[PDB]
Amino acid sequence: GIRKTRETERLRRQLLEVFWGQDHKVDFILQREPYCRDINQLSEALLSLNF
Amino acid sequence: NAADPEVCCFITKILCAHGGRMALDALLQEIALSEPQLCEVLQVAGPDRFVVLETTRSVVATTRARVCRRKYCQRPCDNLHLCKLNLLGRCNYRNLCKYSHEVLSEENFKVLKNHELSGLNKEELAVLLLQSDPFFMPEICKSYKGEGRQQICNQPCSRLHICDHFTRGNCRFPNCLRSHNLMDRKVLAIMREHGLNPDVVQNIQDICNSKHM
Ligand SMILES: [Zn+2]
Ligand SMILES: [Zn+2]
Ligand SMILES: [Zn+2]
Ligand SMILES: [Zn+2]
Ligand SMILES: [Zn+2]
C-alpha cells in the first residue's frame, strides 16, 4: 500500500522533469495520495489544481 | 473559489516550507494567484489558518490541530499522535520510544484530512505545530504573579514568566498583571534551550496576539 522511499523519490523525479520548478506542488500531490503508484493519475491530479 | 480547501492547504504548505512565515510578495512568486486572488483566500480562511500582519504584508501559518499529551493513550482519541521531543530535535531514540516517530502515519493522515491539511510533509507539519500547539512551549513559572511584583518569583528562573492563558489563547480577563510579551531576552533564552528560535517565537507571539482579539 504505502509507498517506499525509493518509489516516492522515483515518482518525484519523474513528476519534476515534466512540471519543472514545481517542487512544492509535486510533493503536495505525493502526500495527498500516498498509496498511488501511477505516474499518470499523479500527473492528472497535479493538473487539476487551479493555482 | 476563494473558499477552496486545496488552495488553503497549498498556502499553508509553502509558508511552512519557508519557516512558518513569508512576506506576501515572496508567497506570490510561488503560487499562481494574482495578489487580489491570494488576498481573498487569506481573508475568507481567516485568522484560524492565516495571520496577516502589516509590518510590507507578512503571513503567518497556523492551525487548530493538536498533538495528544497523554503519556499512554487508549483509543479512541481524535488528536495527532507523535513524539513531541523528536519534533524539538531532542529525542534520544533500535527505537524504544513509546510515541510515534512516523509523523505521517495512517492515524495521523486521517486527522490531517479532518483539518484539511493532507499535502504537508513531516518537516512542514513540524514547523506548523511548533508555532501553533502550545504543548511545544517550555513550562510556565507557577510562582510568577505579574509585572512589578514578588521580585519576579521565588527565584535564574528556568521557567517562563508569561501569562499561561495568553499562550493557550484564552486570556479573557481585564485585571491580568502577567506578561504577554514573548520577545523578552529571558523568554527567548528559555525558548532557545528548548528548541524554539526567535523567528518561531515571533510567529507564536503574532498568533497569540491574533487569538487575544
Ligand atoms: Zn518555496
Ligand atoms: Zn491520544
Ligand atoms: Zn521519540
Ligand atoms: Zn519563575
Ligand atoms: Zn494574561
Residue numbers in the entry:
A (entry chain B): 669 to 719
B (entry chain A): 0 to 54, 61 to 98, 103 to 164, 167 to 224
What does the paper say about this structure?
ZAP is an antiviral protein that binds to and depletes viral RNA, which is often distinguished from vertebrate host RNA by its elevated CpG content. Of the multiple ZAP cofactors that have been reported, tripartite motif protein 25 (TRIM25) and the KH-like and NYN domain-containing protein (KHNYN) appear especially important for antiviral activity. The ZAP N-terminal RNA binding domain constitutes a minimal core that is essential for antiviral complex activity, and we present a crystal structure of this domain that reveals contacts with the functionally required KHNYN C-terminal domain. We show that KHNYN is an active nuclease that acts in a partly redundant manner with its homolog N4BP1.
We expressed and purified recombinant forms of ZAP-X and the KHNYN CTD and used size-exclusion chromatography (SEC) to test whether the CTD interacts with ZAP-X. Mixing CTD and ZAP-X resulted in a shift in the SEC elution profile relative to either protein alone, indicating a species of higher molecular mass than either CTD or ZAP-X. To determine the molecular details of this interaction, we solved a 2.30-Å crystal structure of ZAP-X bound to KHNYNCTD. Moreover, ZAP-X interacts with a CTD surface opposite the linkage to the NYN domain. Additionally, a hydrophobic patch on KHNYNCTD, including Phe696 and Phe719, binds in a hydrophobic groove on ZAP-X lined by residues Val6, Phe9, Ile30, and Leu32 (Interface 2). Phe655 of KHNYNCTD occupies a hydrophobic pocket of ZAP-X, packed against Gly128. The ZAP-X/KHNYNCTD structure revealed a zinc-binding site formed by the two proteins, with the zinc atom coordinated by ZAP-X Glu29 and His17, KHNYNCTD His692, and a water molecule (Interface 3). The presence of zinc in this site was confirmed by zinc anomalous scattering. In our crystal structure, the KHNYNCTD has the traditional three-helix bundle structure of other CUE ubiquitin binding domains but the previous KHNYNCTD structure has helices of different connectivity, spatial arrangement, and length. Three single amino acid substitutions, at Lys12, His17, and Gly128, reduced or eliminated TRIM25-independent antiviral activity. All variants tested were expressed at similar levels. These results suggest that the KHNYN:ZAP interface observed in the crystal structure contributes to the antiviral activity of ZAP and KHNYN but is likely one of several redundant intermolecular interactions.
